[PDB]
Amino acid sequence: ITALIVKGSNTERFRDKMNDLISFMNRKKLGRDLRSQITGHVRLQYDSHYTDTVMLQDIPASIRAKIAQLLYLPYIKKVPLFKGCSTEFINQIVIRLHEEYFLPGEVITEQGNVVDHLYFVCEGLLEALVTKTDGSEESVTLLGPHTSFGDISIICNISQPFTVRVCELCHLLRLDKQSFSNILEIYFHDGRTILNNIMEEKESNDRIKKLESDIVIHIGKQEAELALKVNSAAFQGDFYQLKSLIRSGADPNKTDYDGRSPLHLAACRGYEDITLFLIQEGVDVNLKDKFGHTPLFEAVKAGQEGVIGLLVK
Amino acid sequence: GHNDYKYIIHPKNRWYKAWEMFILVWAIYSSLFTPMEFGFFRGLPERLFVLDIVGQIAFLVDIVLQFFVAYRDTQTYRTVYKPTRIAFRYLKSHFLMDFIGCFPWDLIYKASGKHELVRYLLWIRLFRVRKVVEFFQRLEKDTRINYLFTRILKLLFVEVYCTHTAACIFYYLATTLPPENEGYTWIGSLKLGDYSYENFREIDLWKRYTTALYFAIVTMATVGYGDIHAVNLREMIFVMIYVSFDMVLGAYLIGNITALIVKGSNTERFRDKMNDLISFMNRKKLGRDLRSQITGHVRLQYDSHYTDTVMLQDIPASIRAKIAQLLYLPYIKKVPLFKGCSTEFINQIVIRLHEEYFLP
Amino acid sequence: LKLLFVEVYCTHTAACIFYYLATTLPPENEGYTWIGSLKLGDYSYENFREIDLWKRYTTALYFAIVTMATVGYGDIHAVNLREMIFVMIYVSFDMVLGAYLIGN
Amino acid sequence: GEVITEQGNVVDHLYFVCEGLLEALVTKTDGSEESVTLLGPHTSFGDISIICNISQPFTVRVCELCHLLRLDKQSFSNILEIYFHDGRTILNNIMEEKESNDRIK
Amino acid sequence: GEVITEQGNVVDHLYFVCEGLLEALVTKTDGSEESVTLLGPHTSFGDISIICNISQPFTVRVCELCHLLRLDKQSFSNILEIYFHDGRTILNNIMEEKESNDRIK
């Protein structure tokens, strides 16, 4: 019987963790309001025991991704942002998601703040109050289940458009802003899907403010970057990324804003590997930039005798 | 401000809290007196009429009030103010037993030709102990009292209540036999000292109750003097049941007390560290200054709660942020290394910032 | 050691209080006290107020020590209602004390 | 079936495949695994990334009961730097091994 | 009865004898180990091969409860590199006390 008691009960662990928290709060003089919020949140972790993912921490990341693709996957499929997006993008979002539960009344994000976390609303009701210039907050949308907030702010690189408050115990799937941006960059095609989804969302009911004007920015920028990335990797010397960039898209004959193909920069910087790879791509060897310069001229001007010979042959 | 109703009162209202404590005291008394009302009386005397009527009135108004008290929904975590939802919850949860216990069972017993089976329904009022259980569970979530200590005070209340109930049931079992077979009952064959409990139905209620509760308490600690013991077979069966159940109850009591003193305390754990350290301090004959340095190490290790850094590793990122940018942020804002940096970069620095303390 | 000292002290005090509650009753009706009705062996504690001090103390402390370990021989028992009440209180308190001893 | 080391991540743990077969694949951005090597018993991986301080070129995932012998990045480097000499003439030989791979450039 | 270092093995740790009796033994090819000396308190071993950089000169075998202070080879080498004059004084002490062992290198 004593062993059974000493093994511990859920409320006993609640008591210990809460008392530790109260020690830390009082000693750091957090403040009545903040003490109330943190106590409420961890009390939530102890009433619903949603922080049962601690066992998950032991289970390795591959199996964790599998459990993620069994639990978080349906909601993220339903998410309006990830409509028509590639399965790989969906999976990467699911793997990087973290479960959270927020008690009613809690202000998750505040209008004007930097959105460091993009939340997927899964099981709950929230609010989208806009803190106007006067300060009155009108509920833009109820942001019901299977939705997302923090998303337009992260992608459009604008501050938080509206304050989000909790109506009912909400099961949010949090995603770090930086992880979202990295996944967005790594899959540029799925990013294109996100941006057209954002634009078609404007044609739909997304109750957004001001103007987004980013799909067209993405149409220009994704392609212009990918070409630039090719040229910049050539100039820096990143042959390894250059192969992947050429295979991903654009064209090894693509030129920059000044009309410089990657061969020009590879010749100037004396990179025989990149120069050879462009040779197998059949890149123009007499292509001339806005300043009337051929890659042979750049190889000679920099005295890259090996690259000079490669271009001469 | 969602209390548009002038009838539903918030469950944390001060006046309703005072009523809750009042009905807790009445629940304690009524649940302690129901075994006494059942065992030691075959029908209440005229002296206790007003007490009985007033008690059931006090619990009936509690039944009435429970339809006007908001309850925090366990799926939406907001105080449901809807009167029909509140009434539905109370009617389906514990309304029937409160209502049945609120019947004047003594007057019904006397009215129904003095039938013992009617009096056997007095044990429905035992379900008023739900109030006491609720009070204890409310204490255990309140962090001003140690949980295990509350879990043992609850077990002490359970033990007090089981002894009182067992004493009443034991004397009732004595009364079940006709007064002609008094010599075959546990109390009717009692000759403690020179006093003989021959006609035990005529002795004053407190003498009988003190004797029966003496039996219950001494058997609760298994002292078993033997001066008082079972005689009938109904008494053997009841004593066997009570003794077998009390074995497990006392074992659980010992287990809970051992839980308190085995879990230990921060003082105890640090003291164990000190015992080991200061012992090493002595075996090697360390200089008192070096000893002071080591003692200062451990002293700051727990005193600045240096161990206490990762409790909030489970609080969500929003609150984790607010804590960090309300505690570590000012220093970083004034650090010349990050002078001129974006506030968001400083926020990221502060989020993963660790705390450490160093002695001179 | 604190619990052992507390338990020993409580036994001694309980024995003294037990004997005192035996003395509260008038000497005429001593047959209703725990010591006045004692017939241990062939020796009867008849004039319990005239016995040697150490016999009285050893009998009272025997009862206290026995009930402290809850042996409950039964030869000495709370005959009075006041004796019963005191034995009830002691026994209930010592159960918690012994549980604390086992836990420590 | 569990990934040991992930491509695009600087390896901080050199593993010695000693029992059980491991499989090394560079999964493409479209989700297509490309098994580049099959590291059986008495093989090593991660060493390129640590010696280079580059990211892992191929994600390595387990295929049988792979009894491996992990060696930390700081541990290895130390055996060469912190354990000077232990990591000078000998590591030069290790560099000869890596250049004799003939793919490392 | 235990052996600390065996004559011929590469020294990885320099040991100092605080208390207890150790025995340095030259194991010849005759099936026997000539007892070079009985290393006592305040002596040291694993230093001849850590300074003269040679193979362990004698098998050090335990005979009592020896409370040995151990110094890692790398650590000692690093400290010698930092403190060159102290290494001088040490090497001086080696040559002045070359009468300690006849088979000393």
Numbering used by the authors:
A (entry chain C): 306 to 618
B (entry chain B): 50 to 409
C (entry chain D): 202 to 305
D (entry chain A), E (entry chain D): 410 to 514
Paper's wording?
The potassium ion efflux channel GORK plays a critical role in closing plant leaf stomata by releasing K+ from guard cells to reduce guard cell volume and turgor. The GUARD CELL OUTWARD-RECTIFYING K+ (GORK) channel is expressed in Arabidopsis guard cells and encodes a K+out channel. Voltage-dependent K+ channels, including GORK, contain three regions: an intracellular N-terminal region, a transmembrane region, and an intracellular C-terminal region (27–30). The transmembrane region is composed of six transmembrane helices (S1-S6), with S1-S4 forming the voltage sensing domain and S5 and S6 forming the pore region.
As a result, five different structures of GORK ranging from the transmembrane region to the C-terminal ANK (designated as GORKWT1–GORKWT5) were determined at resolutions of 3.16 to 3.27 Å. The five GORK structures showed N-terminally an almost uniform transmembrane domain (positions 50 to 313 from the initial Met), including the voltage-sensing domain and the ion selectivity filter. In contrast, the following cytosolic regions, i.e., C-linker (positions 314 to 364), CNBD (positions 365 to 490), CNBD–Ankyrin bridge (positions 491 to 542), and ANK (positions 543 to 722) show five distinct structures in almost twofold symmetry (C2 symmetry). Furthermore, overlaying GORKWT1 and GORKWT5, which had high resolutions of 3.17 and 3.16 Å, respectively, revealed that one of the C-linkers in each dimer was pushed upward by the CNBD in GORKWT1, as compared to GORKWT5. Closer inspection of the structure revealed that the difference of the degree of bending in the C-linker between Mol I and Mol II was small in GORKWT1 but greater in GORKWT5. Additionally, GORKWT1 displayed a C4-like C2 symmetry in the CNBD, whereas GORKWT5 showed a pronounced C2 symmetry. Furthermore, we found a structural difference in the short structure that lies between the CNBD and ANK domains, termed as CNBD–Ankyrin bridge containing residues 511 to 519. This region had an α-helical structure in GORKWT1, while in GORKWT5, it was entirely present in a nonhelical loop conformation. The CNBD–Ankyrin bridges of GORKWT1–GORKWT5 contain a mixture of α-helical and nonhelical structures, and these conformational changes appear to be centered around L516.
